[PDB]
Design a protein around this ligand. Structure first.
Ligand SMILES: *[C@@H]1O[C@H](CO)[C@@H](O)[C@H](O)[C@H]1NC(C)=O
Ligand SMILES: O=c1cc[nH]c(=O)[nH]1
Length: 246
């Protein structure tokens, strides 16, 4: 399991949690020095448990699929909650079985559906460590519209930070003041599967992407990523989604 406490949190302690999260995801090889997530994992070993604690010390446990860093569902006191999607229903066969009741949320976990449920796109939702405190608090008691927004915060400040060093650093900058994600943040989140794929295809193609990936940069300008020498590949991305799952 991995844990993170908001009470006393600072950029250092958040970076320790993101490191723990990355290190809890199994891999058998690296591709261009980046851990390659596994094609498949059977049974309960598929799911990582993240223990998150708000400022007041209340807690949820979040179940994460280790093949793709997707959040499946979470436990809050004696109730489990899962996305309305087949991978999450499968997860509910293995995790949080001792909950008194299981609620299926009235959406799946992709950004498009969550944003519809929340009533707003994530361009307009501030993120940060204070926002993660708020999200944990919201998830403690069911409210499906509030939960969608909380879950957009939670996914960005855990999974997306684990995937991209730039996103981890953006959350660090928001340790004590929330701010809506930079355009580059959104770009990276949206490009993870594409990038993971192109990096794996570049092996066999001299480091060259078969199809270039369009991104927005740290300055807000629209760059084109064509090969493994790019900083996105050498410095930024930390985990690859296996092409077997693309
Ligand atoms: C590869 O990417 C680098 C870094 O972004 C860029 O300067 C260069 O033009 C690209 N090289 C090739 C061979 O496509
Ligand atoms: O796209 C998805 C679907 C489920 N859970 C996630 O974190 N992301």
């Amino acid at each position: 399991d991995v844990s993170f406490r908001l009470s006393g949190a600072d950029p250092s302690s958040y970076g320790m949690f993101i490191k723990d999260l990355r290190n809890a995801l199994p891999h058998t090889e690296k591709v261009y020095n980046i851990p390659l997530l596994l094609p498949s994992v059977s049974g309960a070993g598929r799911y990582l448990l993240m223990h998150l604690f708000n400022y007041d010390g209340n807690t949820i446990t979040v179940a994460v699929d280790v093949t793709n860093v997707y959040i499946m569902g979470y436990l809050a006191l004696t109730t489990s909650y899962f996305f309305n999607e087949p991978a999450a229903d499968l997860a509910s066969q293995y995790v949080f079985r001792s909950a008194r009741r299981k609620i299926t949320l009235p959406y799946s976990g992709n950004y498009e559906r969550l944003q519809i449920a929340a009533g707003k796109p994530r361009e307009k939702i501030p993120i940060g460590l204070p926002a993660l405190d708020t999200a944990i608090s919201t998830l403690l008691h069911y409210d499906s519209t509030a939960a969608a927004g909380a879950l957009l915060v939670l996914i960005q400040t855990t999974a997306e930070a684990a995937r991209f060093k730039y996103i981890e650093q953006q959350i660090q900058e928001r340790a004590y003041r929330d701010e809506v994600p930079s355009s580059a943040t959104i770009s990276l989140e949206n490009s993870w599967s594409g990038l993971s794929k192109q990096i794996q295809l570049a092996q066999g193609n001299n480091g060259v992407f078969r199809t270039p990936t369009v991104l927005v940069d740290s300055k807000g300008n629209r760059v084109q990523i064509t090969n493994v020498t790019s900083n996105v590949v050498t410095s930024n991305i930390q985990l690859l989604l296996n092409t077997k799952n693309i």
